[PDB]
């Protein structure tokens, strides 16, 4: 239906300009989650290219990146650390990168988008994301 949905648990992080580089995170790079062990705070950022309706096919609007924990999501067969185009590897300090959760991916039918908080800092200057309640 939607990408083996596979909907990310958490709201996107849109990019500011076009041609923004892969995100730099200050600290963990890992969204705050109440239902998760400090040991299990690790995952990846996937770059999803967007388009706007228009003249030629469609229109390349700026990039976006979603969050999935290691072993969940459209690159779940990768170990944490695997170098790949379009993925940014993050993990909180002192986290079992050999562990795996069983949180999976958001079933958009419907667990609504999950608000993105980031107590240890956040992504760099080239990225933003809407405010969501809570």
Residue 23 lies in a domain: yes
* Helix, strand and coil percent figures for the chain, each rounded to 5: 0, 25, 75
Q: Whole domain around residue 114: which residue ranges?
A: 8-134
CA-nearest of 87, 93, 105 to 1 is: 105
Q: Phi, psi at residue 47, to the nearest 5°? A: -85, 115
Count of positions (residues) in the chain: 134
* Residue 74 CB coordination number (10 Å): 17
Residue 83 lies in a domain: yes
* CA–CA separation, 76 and 71 (whole Å): 4
Residue 1 lies in a domain: no
B/e letters for 97-122, b = 16+ CB within 10 Å, e = fewer, are eeeebebebbeeeeeebbebebeeeb
Residue 2 lies in a domain: no
Split into its structural domains, the chain has a count of: 1
- In the sheet that holds 87-91, the strands lie side by side as 87-91, 42-47, 64-69, 13-15, 127-128
Nearest-10 Cα torsion for 128, 69, 41, 101: 150
Nearest-10 Cα torsion for 62, 63, 67, 73: 130
Residue 3 lies in a domain: no
Structure-token match 């958001």, residue found = 106
């Amino acid at each position: 239906h939607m990408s083996s949905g596979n909907a990310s648990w958490f709201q996107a992080i849109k990019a500011k300009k076009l041609n923004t580089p892969p995100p730099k995170f200050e600290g963990s790079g890992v969204p705050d989650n109440e239902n998760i062990k400090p040991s299990q705070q690790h995952g990846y950022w996937r770059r999803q290219a967007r388009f706007k309706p228009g003249k030629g096919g469609r229109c390349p609007v700026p990039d976006a990146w979603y969050f999935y924990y290691t072993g969940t999501g459209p690159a779940a067969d990768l170990n944490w650390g695997d170098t790949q185009d379009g993925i940014v590897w993050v993990a909180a300090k002192g986290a079992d990168t050999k562990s795996r959760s069983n949180q999976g991916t958001r079933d958009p039918d419907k667990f609504d988008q999950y608000p993105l908080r980031f107590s240890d800092g956040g992504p760099d200057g080239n990225f933003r994301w809407d405010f969501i309640p809570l």
